[PDB]
Each structure stands twice: as C-alpha cells, then as structure tokens.
C-alpha cells in the first residue's frame, strides 16, 4: 500500500495538473475564439 | 467519440459547393464554445472537490503529530 | 472537519467528473476536427 | 488567457483581404489540436493519480472494520 506521505504528494500533483489543465483551456479557448472570428468575417464577406 | 455528428454538423464537399460549409462551421463553433464552457464548469468543481479531499488528508497528517 | 464517508464520496464524484470531462473532450475534438476538414477543403479550393 | 496571440495567430480583416486568413486559421487548428492532445495526456494522468489516492482511502476505510 501507499503511505500518507505519497497520498499527500499525489494530492499536490493533482491540484497542480488541474490548474495546468485550466491554463491550457484558456489558451485553447482564446484560439478557438479567433477561429470563430475568422469564420464570422468570412460569412459576412459572402453577404456583402 | 460518443455523440457522433449529425448531417447538420458533418461538412462534406457537397456542402461546400452549396455554400453552406461556412454556416455548418459556425454551428460547430457554437457547439464547441458551449462544450468548452461546460468543461470550465467541471474543473472548477473538480478543483473544489479535490481541495476538500486535501483538507481531510492534511488534518489526518497532523493527528499523528 | 469532513469524515471518511464524505471523503470517499468526494473521491467517487471526482472520478466521475473526470470521466465526464474525458467524454466531453472526445465530442469536442470530433467537432474541432470537422472544422479543420472544412478549413482544409476551403484552402484547396483556393489552390485549384 | 496566459499566452496571448502572436500576429501569426491573430486574424484581422487586413489578413482576409490578403487571403491569409485561411492559413492562419489552419495554424490555429494545428495549435488547438496539440493542446487537445496535451489535455488528453493530463486527464489520463489525473485519472491514474486520483485512482491511487482512492485505494489509499479504501484501505483505511477497511482498517476500521
Ligand atoms: Mg452537412
Ligand atoms: Mg495576422
């Protein structure tokens, strides 16, 4: 079995990977939004 | 995958030559934006739940001491 | 403080929300890929 | 956000009238695909780490019994 020391180490790694996923999602969402901006601009070009 | 794509979300060359690829792409964008918001909701939940599990582990590390 | 019973309940909810995020990512990636397919088709139209 | 977008990832109306909006969108696609793969790597890691924390909690629930 695992001890309390490794359990607390796993807990710290979980929280840091969670925050890490959060930061990747922000950067991902920033890029998806710019894809959307491009798509909206293309759509309006074809209606001008 | 789990939910596979409907004809309204599948973009074919037939769609492009009809000029509806752009609007289907904008539909995909709407769905992706909502899913991203849902995943944002869940990690906030996960962060909160993990932190509560963390305080349980901490208080029992100090009952040794 | 929280008890062992709620700690184990939190653990189950964490794993189920994790799997839940995984399923949302698959569906998200499926849709991003189709956006990419559209973009690749548009790019090749402008080079034909 | 954290990493803001470079001019190579920012899509302006100036880019569209130069006909490079499509290639910048394809650049954004490449970056998004890599980030999605990274987030996939991390949840596998998170699932494995959470499960190991789970077996510690289970074995201590049964040391009561
Ligand atoms: Mg279609
Ligand atoms: Mg640019």
Numbering used by the authors:
A (entry chain AAAB), C (entry chain AAAB): 310 to 357
B (entry chain AAAA), D (entry chain AAAA): 292 to 356
Show the paper's wording.
Phosphorus starvation response 1 (CrPsr1) from Chlamydomonas and PHOSPHATE STARVATION RESPONSE 1 (AtPHR1) from Arabidopsis were founding members of plant-unique MYB-type coiled-coil (MYB-CC) transcription factors. PHR binds to a GNATATNC motif (P1BS), found highly enriched in the promoters of PSI genes and in other cis-regulatory motifs, activating gene expression. However, AtPHR1222 – 358 Olig1 and AtPHR1222 – 358 Olig2 bound a biotinylated P1BS immobilized on the GCI chip with ~20-fold reduced affinity when compared to the wild-type control. Together, our experiments suggest that PHR1 may exist as a tetramer or dimer in solution, and that disruption of its plant-unique CC domain interface reduces the capacity of the transcription factor to bind its DNA recognition site. Together, our in vivo experiments reveal that SPX receptors interact with the CC domain of AtPHR1 via the surface-exposed Lys325, His328, and Arg335, and that this interaction negatively regulates PHR activity and PSRs.
We obtained crystals of a putative AtSPX1–InsP8–AtPHR1280–360 complex diffracting to 2.4 Å resolution and solved the structure by molecular replacement, using isolated SPX domain structures as search models. Iterative cycles of model building and crystallographic refinement yielded, to our surprise, a well-refined model of AtPHR1280–360 only (see “Methods”). Analysis with the program PISA revealed the presence of a crystallographic tetramer in which four long α-helices fold into an unusual anti-parallel four-stranded coiled-coil. AtPHR1280–360 residues 292–356 and 310–357 are visible in the electron density maps from chain A and B, respectively. Structural homology searches with the program DALI43 returned different coiled-coil structures, with a monomer of the tetrameric coiled-coil domain of the yeast transcription factor Ctp1 representing the closest hit (DALI Z-score 5.9, r.m.s.d. is ~1 Å comparing 45 corresponding Cɑ atoms). However, no anti-parallel four-stranded coiled-coil domain with structural similarity to AtPHR1 was recovered, with, for example, the Ctp1 dimer-of-dimers domain having a very different configuration.
